Design a protein around this nucleic acid. Sequence first.
DNA 1: ATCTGTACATGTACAGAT
DNA 2: ATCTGTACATGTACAGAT
DNA 3: ATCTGTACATGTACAGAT
DNA 4: ATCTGTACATGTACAGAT
Lengths: 348, 356
Amino acid sequence: DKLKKVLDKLRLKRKDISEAAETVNKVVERLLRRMQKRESEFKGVEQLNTGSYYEHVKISAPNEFDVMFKLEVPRIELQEYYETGAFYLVKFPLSHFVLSATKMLSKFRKIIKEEVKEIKDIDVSVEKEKPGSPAVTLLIRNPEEISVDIILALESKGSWPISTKEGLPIQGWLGTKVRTNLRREPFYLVPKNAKDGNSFQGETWRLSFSHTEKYILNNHGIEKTCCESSGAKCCRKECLKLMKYLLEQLKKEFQELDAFCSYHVKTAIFHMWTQDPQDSQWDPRNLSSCFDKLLAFFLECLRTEKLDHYFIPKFNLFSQELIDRKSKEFLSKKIEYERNNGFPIFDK
Amino acid sequence: DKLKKVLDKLRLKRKDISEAAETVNKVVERLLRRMQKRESEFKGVEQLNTGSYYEHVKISAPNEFDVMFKLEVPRIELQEYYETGAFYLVKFKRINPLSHFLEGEVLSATKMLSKFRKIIKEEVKEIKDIDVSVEKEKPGSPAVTLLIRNPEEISVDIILALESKGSWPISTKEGLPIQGWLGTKVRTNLRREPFYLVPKNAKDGNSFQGETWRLSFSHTEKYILNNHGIEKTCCESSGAKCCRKECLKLMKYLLEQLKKEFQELDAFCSYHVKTAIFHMWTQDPQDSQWDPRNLSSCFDKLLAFFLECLRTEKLDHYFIPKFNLFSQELIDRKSKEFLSKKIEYERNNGFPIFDK
DNA sequence: ATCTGTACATGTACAGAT
DNA sequence: ATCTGTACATGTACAGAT
DNA sequence: ATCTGTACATGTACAGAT
DNA sequence: ATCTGTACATGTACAGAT
Ligand SMILES: Nc1ncnc2c1ncn2[C@@H]1O[C@H](COP(=O)(O)OP(=O)(O)OP(=O)(O)O)[C@@H](O)[C@H]1O
Ligand SMILES: Nc1ncnc2c1ncn2[C@@H]1O[C@H](COP(=O)(O)OP(=O)(O)OP(=O)(O)O)[C@@H](O)[C@H]1O
Ligand SMILES: [Mg+2]
Ligand SMILES: [Mg+2]
Ligand SMILES: [Mn+2]
Ligand SMILES: [Mn+2]
Ligand SMILES: [Zn+2]
Ligand SMILES: [Zn+2]
């Protein structure tokens, strides 16, 4: 009852969707164009739209879009970086860049900034670089604020790295045929651009499965008909939206929650969808029970300090090395509070 | 129980499968290489294995393989033959390797199938390691059939197919009604695949005889057979086993046994059985309506349904609704009532023909 | 020297065999 | 319940062509 | 190698019927 | 309240033309 009303608030409006989309489409097409017919090191970069807006789980407003400019590359000798599972060195046009991640992303960002300087019909700037991010982020105002993440990615057509062999455990849910075919797709690398002052950080890329997460979001039933015109609606995505919203409201209020992002909710719910594969475990009439069991799952994750990357099982997103024990214990208290008092944070 | 044991008789043996496939693959490899030589008009033809053996529903013995030699053909052509839904003339706006087979702008099917059969006959002549000859042409068949003695008898239907990548012909807009069973996404993807035309090749005395082609969906049928469930894990190693294919096998076998004994059943063929079960899978989409424990009643309802098709003289092509495979124009009422009685008899006497 | 149609290499579902 | 042959989808090598 | 055309998936929006 | 049917909107895959 309450939760249906929250979801009506979170719904994007069809007019807001078309106004933001045509501006975003304008800038992205023009930037993609500058990469090609202009003989750059990125000639042949291709576009792949990723993230919440294209998965149809964007909440509140259409104000943040995610785009991959992916580039196919051949002699890619990979070499796992110090057992982290998700970070890698790359070895063997691009002779201008070991293939250095910062070196390559710098030229990518120089080109974009240049072309953004030559855009006279939209209010669009390049956000100052965030050490920690693989993105070049645009800030558009038309007039409302829209941020766009342009993510450079290497594309490799080889088999997936050893560290993912036990990942993507969809066999009881989406099945073994879906899994084998998914793993026949390419995989993608992106910059680790964090200034932790640590080791090989500057040449380290990171695995990306944004194309696989997109498929799963739109092929999310054990039944082929789930959420189709001739099937039965489930509420899996509405739980993602509600869990994503509770963390947006908690991050807006407390800076002690700065280390948490939507990807932590996303990974948590991928495990929940695998734990509870049956589409009837997600009946719209049980929206409350499902949201509450997801909350509980996410609290068990904070209590055990354990949230494994859905595709890279040995890479713990909640390790002491990324998030303080106290930050997790903090988030836990605020979730339990919202939980056990009917979610006051939703009414503001 | 009784039906558990028929399926064990019906089950193919790996030794037999291994020996038959070794031979069959060597022959098809050689015929395919020869298609690519010289000014062969069929250079660029590609292989696609279809039929019961590759759908895993081939029963009793591995002795009949079906394989398409498909050839891609562009432009935008096609004219439906007399509102039949299934049959077409193939034209060409472009006026070239198929030029030797045109008649004006109309591509002759029996001209192409002749040159196709000629080349196969030659290459089989020069095979001196396998006992393999070319079966005398059957009217109405698009196939060039090989008979291999292995020393066991083995049939191989080489089917000549045109491949078109355009949208499917409008006579199929309402066909393939899988939206409640396999879903709309599957339907959209399946219909983005090519469609195929094979020679009609009758000598009926009808106008356009040697230039009439017939639609074929063997490739979409292979997908459906191997992806037959509402649940993605159906019959997979972390999902539940169903009994959809086991019903098709038992029914193939009922018709196979009867067609051996009685000549009256010559108008009937396994495609009729296959078509009927696609309707039954559409009527009963849930995997739970095909539980292995209810194999008896699953086979029973398919029987009832096949009987209703025979008596009401109605069995629509799964992909071309307006095409009725059981129309009086195709099979006599006398032929349909005969099989109808033979089916009720088996159904209501403990299935004696299985013990044959 | 590079290009590339052909065929080998790789991985895994399906289902027979044990 | 595990071992295993066949089919098949896609990546990759390279003898022979350019 | 590039780009438009097509079809239908995913949505929002709403009125009528339940 | 919710289910259904139609209108309206964007995203995406791929055939075919240039
Ligand atoms: N830490 C990460 N590791 C791997 N992939 C990530 C990570 N963070 C983000 N991604 C990928 O990039 C996409 C965009 O991330 P972003 O931060 O915009 O979140 P989102 O899923 O788009 O949702 P929202 O923007 O609405 O919070 C994600 O959907 C995911 O595929
Ligand atoms: N009359 C027909 N109309 C349309 N397609 C047909 C027809 N007959 C056969 N086919 C197609 O060609 C394939 C091969 O036909 P075939 O007679 O070998 O049957 P099958 O399904 O392979 O089984 P089996 O050979 O074991 O009886 C079929 O699976 C079907 O896809
Ligand atoms: Mg986003
Ligand atoms: Mg066959
Ligand atoms: Mn982002
Ligand atoms: Mn046949
Ligand atoms: Zn759903
Ligand atoms: Zn099944």
